[PDB]
Amino acid sequence: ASIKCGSRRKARRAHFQAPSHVRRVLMSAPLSKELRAKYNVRAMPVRKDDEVIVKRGTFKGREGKVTACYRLKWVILIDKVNREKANGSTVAVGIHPSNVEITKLKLTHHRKSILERKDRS
Amino acid sequence: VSLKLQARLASSILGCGRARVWLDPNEAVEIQNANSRKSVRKLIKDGFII
Amino acid sequence: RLSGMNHSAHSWGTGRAVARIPRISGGGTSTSGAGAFGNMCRGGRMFAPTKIFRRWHRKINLHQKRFAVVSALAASSVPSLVMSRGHQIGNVPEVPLVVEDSIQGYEKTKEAMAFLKAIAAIDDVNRVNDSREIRAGRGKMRNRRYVARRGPMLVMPNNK
Amino acid sequence: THYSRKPQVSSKSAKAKVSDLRCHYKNTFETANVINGMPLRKAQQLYRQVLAKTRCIPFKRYNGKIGRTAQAKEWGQTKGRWPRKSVVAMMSLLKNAEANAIEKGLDPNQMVIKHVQVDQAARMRRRTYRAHGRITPYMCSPCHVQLFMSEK
Amino acid sequence: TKGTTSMGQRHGRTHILCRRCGRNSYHVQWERCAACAYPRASRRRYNWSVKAIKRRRTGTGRCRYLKVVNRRIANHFKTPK
RNA sequence: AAGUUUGAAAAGCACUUUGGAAAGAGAGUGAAAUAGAACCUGAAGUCGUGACAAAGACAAUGGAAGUACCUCCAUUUCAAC
RNA sequence: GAUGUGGCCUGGAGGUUAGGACGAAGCUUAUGGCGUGAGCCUAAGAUGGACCGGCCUCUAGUGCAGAUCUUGGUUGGCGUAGCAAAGAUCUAACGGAGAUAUACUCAACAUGCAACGUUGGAUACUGGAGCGGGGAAGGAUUUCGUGCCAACGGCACUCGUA
RNA sequence: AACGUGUCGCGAUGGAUGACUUGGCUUCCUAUUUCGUUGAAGAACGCAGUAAAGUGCGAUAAGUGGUAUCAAUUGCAGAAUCAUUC
Numbered sequence: 001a002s003i004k005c006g007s008r009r010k011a012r013r014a015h016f017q018a019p020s021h022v023r024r025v026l027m028s029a030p031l032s033k034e035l036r037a038k039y040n041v042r043a044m045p046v047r048k049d050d051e052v053i054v055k056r057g058t059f060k061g062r063e064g065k066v067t068a069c070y071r072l073k074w075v076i077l078i079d080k081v082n083r084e085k086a087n088g089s090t091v092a093v094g095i096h097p098s099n100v101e102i103t104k105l106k107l108t109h110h111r112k113s114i115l116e117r118k119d120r121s
Numbered sequence: 122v123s124l125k126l127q128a129r130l131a132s133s134i135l136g137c138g139r140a141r142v143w144l145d146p147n148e149a150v151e152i153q154n155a156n157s158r159k160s161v162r163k164l165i166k167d168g169f170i171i
Numbered sequence: 172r173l174s175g176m177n178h179s180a181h182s183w184g185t186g187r188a189v190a191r192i193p194r195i196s197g198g199g200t201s202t203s204g205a206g207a208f209g210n211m212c213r214g215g216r217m218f219a220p221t222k223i224f225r226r227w228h229r230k231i232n233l234h235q236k237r238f239a240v241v242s243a244l245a246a247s248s249v250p251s252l253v254m255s256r257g258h259q260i261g262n263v264p265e266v267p268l269v270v271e272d273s274i275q276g277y278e279k280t281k282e283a284m285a286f287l288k289a290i291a292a293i294d295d296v297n298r299v300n301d302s303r304e305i306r307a308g309r310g311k312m313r314n315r316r317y318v319a320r321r322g323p324m325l326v327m328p329n330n331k
Numbered sequence: 332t333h334y335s336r337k338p339q340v341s342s343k344s345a346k347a348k349v350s351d352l353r354c355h356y357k358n359t360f361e362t363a364n365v366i367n368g369m370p371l372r373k374a375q376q377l378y379r380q381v382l383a384k385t386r387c388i389p390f391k392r393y394n395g396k397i398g399r400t401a402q403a404k405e406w407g408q409t410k411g412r413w414p415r416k417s418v419v420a421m422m423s424l425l426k427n428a429e430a431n432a433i434e435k436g437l438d439p440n441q442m443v444i445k446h447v448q449v450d451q452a453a454r455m456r457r458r459t460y461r462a463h464g465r466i467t468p469y470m471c472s473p474c475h476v477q478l479f480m481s482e483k
Numbered sequence: 484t485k486g487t488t489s490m491g492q493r494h495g496r497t498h499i500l501c502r503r504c505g506r507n508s509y510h511v512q513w514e515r516c517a518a519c520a521y522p523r524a525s526r527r528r529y530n531w532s533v534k535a536i537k538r539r540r541t542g543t544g545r546c547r548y549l550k551v552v553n554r555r556i557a558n559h560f561k562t563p564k
Numbered sequence: 565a566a567g568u569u570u571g572a573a574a575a576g577c578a579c580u581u582u583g584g585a586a587a588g589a590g591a592g593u594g595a596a597a598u599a600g601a602a603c604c605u606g607a608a609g610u611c612g613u614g615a616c617a618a619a620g621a622c623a624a625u626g627g628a629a630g631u632a633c634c635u636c637c638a639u640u641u642c643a644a645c
Numbered sequence: 646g647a648u649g650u651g652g653c654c655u656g657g658a659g660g661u662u663a664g665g666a667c668g669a670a671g672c673u674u675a676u677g678g679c680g681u682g683a684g685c686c687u688a689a690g691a692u693g694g695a696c697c698g699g700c701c702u703c704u705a706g707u708g709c710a711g712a713u714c715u716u717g718g719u720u721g722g723c724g725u726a727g728c729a730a731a732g733a734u735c736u737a738a739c740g741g742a743g744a745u746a747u748a749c750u751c752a753a754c755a756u757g758c759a760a761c762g763u764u765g766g767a768u769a770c771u772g773g774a775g776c777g778g779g780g781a782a783g784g785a786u787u788u789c790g791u792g793c794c795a796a797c798g799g800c801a802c803u804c805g806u807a
Numbered sequence: 808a809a810c811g812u813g814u815c816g817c818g819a820u821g822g823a824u825g826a827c828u829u830g831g832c833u834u835c836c837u838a839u840u841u842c843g844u845u846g847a848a849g850a851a852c853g854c855a856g857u858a859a860a861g862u863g864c865g866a867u868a869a870g871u872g873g874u875a876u877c878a879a880u881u882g883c884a885g886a887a888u889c890a891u892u893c
C-alpha cells in the first residue's frame with residue numbers, strides 16, 4: 001500500500017500500524033508455477049482454505065491447508081504444520097505467508113474478480 | 122478454630138458483654154458450626170452458650 | 172528554545188549543605204529538589220543550544236567555481252589520475268572516452284547494458300554493484316542505509 | 332544463582348540451594364560457613380545443639396561489638412551467638428540436600444559437605460521515621476545459600 | 484505552637500470541587516473557582532503560565548464536536564444527491 | 565520514574581522426587597535456559613567462595629635495582645647448527 | 646602564557662579500500678608486541694550474536710578526578726545506635742507446616758529452640774472528664790462473611806483497618 | 808593460630824555499554840483548510856458475553872446506517888453465511 005518511501009521511520013510505522021485490510025495484501029504468497037501460468041498472476045493474498053507448500057524455514061516442503069490468517073501476528077496457520085507441547089497437546093506453528101507457495105486457491109466470486117483484474121495479459 | 126463470630130453474635134443476642142458470655146470449652150465443633158443468629162439462639166437454648 | 176528550561180527552578184542557597192544549583196520546586200515526585208537548568212544536570216539545558224541561523228550555506232566566487240570545474244575536467248582526461256581515484260578503466264579504449272550519439276535512441280535497459288559492455292565501462296559498473304553494503308553507524312537509522320562507490324559518468328548533450 | 336564450584340564426582344554428590352531466603356545475610360553467613368567441611372549428620376547435630384543453646388555459631392567476620400561466650404572456645408574464637416532463624420533455615424536446606432542424595436541413591440550417613448556459599452541477595456526496602464521529620468532507610472538484607480555434599 | 488501541633492487545628496475546607504472544571508479549586512466562602520474563575524463567563528488564562536494554558540487548551544479533551552465538523556469541512560460539507 | 569529489547573517460533577519447562585508453601589533436585593523444549601519470563605548484550609564498584617601468595621608491629625600505596633617462586637605470553641634455537 | 650605537531654582519540658558526512666554466521670559491535674585480561682607519549686595492534690574468552698575496520702577530505706553537542714558539581718547504583722560505619730512513657734501477665738486444652746523433627750552409641754535431662762489464633766480458667770488494668778455508647782468536621786468501604794500469609798502492620802502472627 | 812591482606816578461577820549484587828528505534832527535534836511544501844445559542848472548547852458520569860486503566864463510543868453507548876473492500880476478529884467465548892448485495 002505504497003508503504004516504502006524515503007523515510008525508514010515512516011515506512012516502518014505504516015507497515016506495523018497497517019489496518020487489517022492492508023495487512024491482508026502485505027501477507028501475500030506467490031502462486032505455484034502451474035497456477036501462475038493458468039491465471040497469469042504472480043502472487044495472491046493468502047486466505048483460509050488455501051493449499052500451500054512451505055518453501056523456507058524448518059517446515060520447508062510441508063503441504064497443508066490454511067486454517068487461519070491471524071493477521072495480528074503476521075502469520076498463517078497450516079493444519080499439517082504443528083508441533084507438540086510439554087503436556088502432549090498439538091499446537092499450530094505460525095508461518096509468514098511470504099515463506100510459502102499457494103498450490104490451490106479457495107475460489108469465491110470476489111476472489112475471481114481479483115484474479116481477473118490482476119490478469120496481466 | 123476461631124469462635125469470634127459466635128462470641129460476637131452471643132454478646133448481641135444476650136445483650137451483655139463478652140466477659141459475661143460463656144462459650145463451652147468443649148463442644149467447640151458444634152459452636153463453630155453456628156454461623157447465624159438463629160443457630161446461636163439454639164446453642165443458648167441447648168446450654169452451649171451461657 | 173524551551174528545552175531543559177521549562178521549570179520553576181531556583182537555587183536553595185548556601186545555608187543548606189548542597190551545591191548552589193537551581194532545583195525543581197515542589198514535592199511528592201522523584202524530580203522534586205533535583206538539579207535543573209544546568210548543562211551538567213540531568214534534564215537540564217544543553218550548553219550553547221543550537222540555532223537555525225547558523226551559517227549553513229557558503230558563497231563561492233563564480234570564477235573559482237568555473238576554475239574548479241575546468242580543473243576537474245582536465246584531470247578526467249588523465250588515465251593515471253582516473254585510476255588513482257579508483258576506477259577500473261583497464262579495458263576502455265581511450266581517455267577521454269567518446270562514443271557515438273546513437274545511444275540516445277535506446278529504449279531498453281538491455282541495450283544500454285550491451286553498450287556498456289561493448290565500451291568496457293561494465294568493470295566500473297560491477298565495482299559499484301559489488302560495493303553495495305549497509306552503511307556503518309547511525310546513518311542507517313537515518314535515511315542513508317545503503318552506500319556504494321561512484322561509477323562512470325555518461326554525459327549527454329541535452330536532457331534526452 | 333548458579334553453583335560457583337563443581338563436585339569432583341557428580342554421580343556421588345547431592346546439591347541444594349535457596350534464593351532470597353529472607354534471613355539476615357550476616358547471621359546466615361556465619362551459620363552456614365561452620366558446616367563447610369563437616370559430615371552431614373554432624374552438621375545436623377550441631378544445629379540441634381545450637382537450638383538447645385549448648386553449642387554456639389562462631390561469628391568470625393560479622394562480629395563487630397557482639398557479646399562474648401565460652402561456647403565459642405571450641406571454634407578458636409571468643410564471640411559467638413545462637414541465630415535460631417538462620418539455623419532453622421539451614422536445617423531445612425540440609426533436609427533438601429539429604430532428600431536429593433536419597434533420590435540419587437546415595438547414603439546420607441556417608442555424605443560430607445564440600446561447598447558452602449552465602450551471597451548477598453537483593454535488598455528489600457522499608458522506611459523508618461526519625462527526629463525533625465526525617466525519613467531514613469530501614470533495609471532488609473536477604474541472602475542466597477548454595478551447597479553440595481559428596482559421599483566419602 | 485506553630486508546626487506539628489497547629490497542623491491539628493486545620494479544620495474544614497477552603498476549596499471544594501468546581502462544577503465547571505472539577506479541579507477542587509472552588510472557594511466555598513467566596514463562591515468562585517481559583518482555577519477557572521467560575522461563575523465568571525470567561526475562564527482564567529495568563530501568559531505568565533503558558534504551561535497552565537496548554538494544560539487546559541483545546542485538544543486536551545475529547546473534541547467531541549470538533550472532530551465531526553473538521554471532517555465535514557475537509558469533505559466540503561458533502562451531502563447525498 | 566518507566567524501552568515488556570525472552571526466542572525464529574511459547575516450543576513459556578509435561579512428568580518424577582523433597583518441601584506446608586516458596587522453591588530445590590531431576591527431567592524436558594530450544595541452535596542457545598549462564599535466552600526461564602517485565603528474561604538481548606550484562607561493564608564498573610562491592611561482596612561470597614575454592615585454590616594459592618605470603619605477611620610481625622614502620623598506615624597503605626609509590627620509585628630504583630636485584631632475587632625467590634610462578635607464568636593458557638612472546639621470540640629464538642635444536643647439529644658442527 | 647604562546648606556538649607547532651604526514652601528533653593521539655570520539656560521533657556524523659563526502660570519497661576510496663576492505664572485513665563479517667568459519668562470528669560484527671560491545672565486554673573481559675599475570676594476551677603479549679609496538680610507540681618517549683596520547684594510544685595502536687595481535688592473542689584468548691570454556692564472551693557475545695549482526696554489523697563494521699583502514700586511508701584522504703569534510704564536519705561537530707569530540708577526550709574528565711574532584712565544580713559542598715547532576716542522575717543512578719554501591720559502600721565502611723554495622724548486625725552497631727537502638728526498637729525502655731501509657732504498670733502485667735500466667736495456665737491447660739484445642740487449632741496450625743510452624744513438632745515431642747536425632748548417623749552410631751544411647752531410657753528420659755545433657756542434641757528442634759523460640760514464637761502464635763481461639764475457648765475455659767487465673768491475675769490485673771481502664772475507673773463513667775473511660776483503651777464505654779452515639780454524632781459533626783474530615784475520611785470514603787476502613788463496615789460484614791469466606792478464603793488467604795507473597796509484600797505491609799519498624800518483634801511476631803495461624804491475626805489484621807493487609 | 809585467628810582476624811585481616813594480595814592474586815587467580817567461578818559465582819552474587821548492580822543495570823553501564825553496544826546493537827536496536829512505530830519517539831523527539833528541526834527545516835520545507837500542498838489546500839473549495841479555521842469552532843460555538845442548529846449549545847462549542849473544557850469538565851462529569853456511563854457503554855463490551857468476559858473489561859481496572861487507556862482507546863473508541865453515548866441508553867442506537869468498543870457502536871446504527873451508506874460506500875468501497877472481499878474472509879475475518881482473536882486471550883477465552885459466541886456466531887445465521889461459508890459469501891454477487893441481502
Ligand SMILES: NC[C@@H]1O[C@H](O[C@H]2[C@@H](O)[C@H](O[C@@H]3[C@@H](O)[C@H](N)C[C@H](N)[C@H]3O[C@H]3O[C@H](CO)[C@@H](O)[C@H](O)[C@H]3N)O[C@@H]2CO)[C@H](N)[C@@H](O)[C@@H]1O
Pocket residue numbers: 598673674690815818819
Ligand atoms: N579475577 C579477578 C577480577 O576479575 C574481574 O573480572 C572478571 C569478570 O568481570 C570477568 O567475567 C567473567 C569471565 O571472565 C568468565 N570467562 C565468565 C564469567 N561469566 C564472567 O563473570 C561474569 O559472569 C558471571 C555469571 O555468568 C557473574 O557471576 C560474574 O559476576 C560476572 N563477572 O572475568 C574476569 C576475570 O578475568 C575484574 N576485572 C577485576 O575486579 C578482577 O581482576
Ligand SMILES: [K+]
Pocket residue numbers: 190191192
Ligand atoms: K553549583
Ligand SMILES: [K+]
Pocket residue numbers: 205206207212213214215715716
Ligand atoms: K537533575
Ligand SMILES: [K+]
Pocket residue numbers: 522523524
Ligand atoms: K456562569
Ligand SMILES: [K+]
Pocket residue numbers: 531532533534535
Ligand atoms: K508556569
Ligand SMILES: [K+]
Pocket residue numbers: 710
Ligand atoms: K585534575
Ligand SMILES: [K+]
Pocket residue numbers: 723
Ligand atoms: K555496613
Ligand SMILES: [K+]
Pocket residue numbers: 788
Ligand atoms: K455495619
Ligand SMILES: [K+]
Pocket residue numbers: 797
Ligand atoms: K513486613
Ligand SMILES: [Mg+2]
Pocket residue numbers: 174175214215216217
Ligand atoms: Mg534535555
Ligand SMILES: [Mg+2]
Pocket residue numbers: 308
Ligand atoms: Mg558503531
Ligand SMILES: [Mg+2]
Pocket residue numbers: 396
Ligand atoms: Mg553496645
Ligand SMILES: [Mg+2]
Pocket residue numbers: 396397398399
Ligand atoms: Mg557487645
Ligand SMILES: [Mg+2]
Pocket residue numbers: 459460461462
Ligand atoms: Mg522514629
Ligand SMILES: [Mg+2]
Pocket residue numbers: 463464487
Ligand atoms: Mg512531623
Ligand SMILES: [Mg+2]
Pocket residue numbers: 485
Ligand atoms: Mg507562621
